[PDB]
Every structure is written in C-alpha cells, then in structure tokens.
C-alpha cells in the first residue's frame, strides 16, 4: 500500500504497506532507507500520537495518506 510520510526539513519517502500491518511494520519499511530505531518511530498525525505497539488497522491511514516522521529526542 502506497502511503506517505514526511520529515521535518521537507523530505518525504515512498514505500509500501498492508491493511493488516503494524505501526512498527510501517517502521519496518522506515529503517530500510534511513536506518532509524523503532523506539524513535514518532508519528504526529493531526495533533495526536499514533502509538507504535498497535497495528495499522486502527489509525485510519487511507490511500497515500501523509504521515509525519520527526526523530525523537527522548530522555528526561
């Protein structure tokens, strides 16, 4: 499934998904180009979090919906 995700400085990437994927299976096709940790998988989709441990079948991402990948600076 062609879905979209965009970074801070304007960069967006293209990848595939499935309706029965998970949010880390979204992430499983995110470190295949950048190499980022799934603990830093940060999704800002209309003011709320998209939680990583859930599946893709709860977070209403439609055909070529744009996500927002910012890297995390967690800790304290």
């Amino acid at each position: 499934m062609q879905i979209f995700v965009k970074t801070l400085t304007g960069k967006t990437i293209t990848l595939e998904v499935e309706p029965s994927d998970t949010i880390e299976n979204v992430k499983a096709k995110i470190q295949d180009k950048e190499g980022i940790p799934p603990d830093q998988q940060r999704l800002i989709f209309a003011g709320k979090q998209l939680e990583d441990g859930r599946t893709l079948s709860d977070y209403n991402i439609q055909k070529e919906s744009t996500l927002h990948l910012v890297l995390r600076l967690r800790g304290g």
């Binding site: 603990d39 003011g47 967690r74 800790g75 304290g76």
Partner: protein
C-alpha cells in the same frame, strides 16, 4: 495583553466541562499558581490513590510549557521525590495549542502505561523491567502510605 485572558479561558471551559477522574483549579486568587487533583486508573496499582499537583505558569505561558510538579509521594519510575515529571510534552514537544485539560489527560496516561525508557529513577525502572510482583505491590503499598 500577553498572558491573562488565555489562562482565564482555559479555566472557564473546565468550569464548563469538568474532567471526570480529574479536577483542577487555582490556589485561591493567584492566577499563576494552580492546583490539580486526580484519581488513579482502575487498570493500575495507582487505583485508589488521589494525587495533588503543584502548578506554576510562567510569564510566557502560552509560549512556554508550564512548570508542574506532584505533591503526593508515589512509587513511580517517571516521578522523583521532587514530583518532577519526565514527560515528553512538558518539553520540546510543546505546542501552544495544548490545553491543560489535555495535559492532564497525558498525566494519568503516563500513570496508565509507565514508559520505562526515560528512567527518572534508575531502581524502579530495573524493578519494572524485571518483576511486576515487586512493582505492583509497592505502588499500592505507598498508596496506603500516602495516597489515601
């Protein structure tokens, strides 16, 4: 100009719609120091406990996240003895659109899930990643100590 009517509006809508297991308000007639009050989630050892909050808005509040700490002593990894709260949106994830009610939703949400990878206490994070019978015990133990 900058500060007051933003604060009074968020006060007014909680007076319109009070939160269910939470409650918050100012400490008397000082607008820049409030008091919140919550109850623990039923799916937690934090259930049965009531917790009070020391709140200080800054003078650039609508543009700086506030300084807010707990009063009650709690057995929690993301809370120190000072009641400082290692929470993400209390830091650079801040947006000025955020309401304190929605902030208070995040607080019990941290009491719900307890994200351990930001270990504000080192020892409790090791206990939580090893033995749930030790962690879930002492939280209800210090609830009966403090949060009654």
């Amino acid at each position: 100009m900058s500060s007051s009517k933003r604060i009074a509006k968020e006060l007014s809508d909680l007076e319109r719609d009070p939160p269910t297991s939470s409650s918050a308000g100012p400490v008397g007639d000082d607008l820049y120091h409030w008091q919140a009050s919550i109850m623990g989630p039923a799916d937690s050892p934090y259930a049965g406990g009531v917790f009070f909050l020391s709140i200080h808005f800054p003078t650039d509040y609508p543009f700086k996240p506030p300084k807010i700490s707990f009063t009650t002593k709690i057995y929690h990894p993301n809370i120190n003895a000072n009641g400082n709260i290692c929470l993400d949106i209390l830091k650079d994830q801040w947006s000025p659109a955020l309401t304190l009610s929605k902030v208070l939703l995040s607080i019990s949400s941290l009491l719900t899930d307890a994200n351990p990878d930001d270990p504000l206490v080192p020892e409790i994070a090791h206990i939580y990643k090893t033995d749930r019978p030790k962690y879930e015990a002492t939280a209800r133990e210090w609830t009966k100590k403090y949060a009654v």
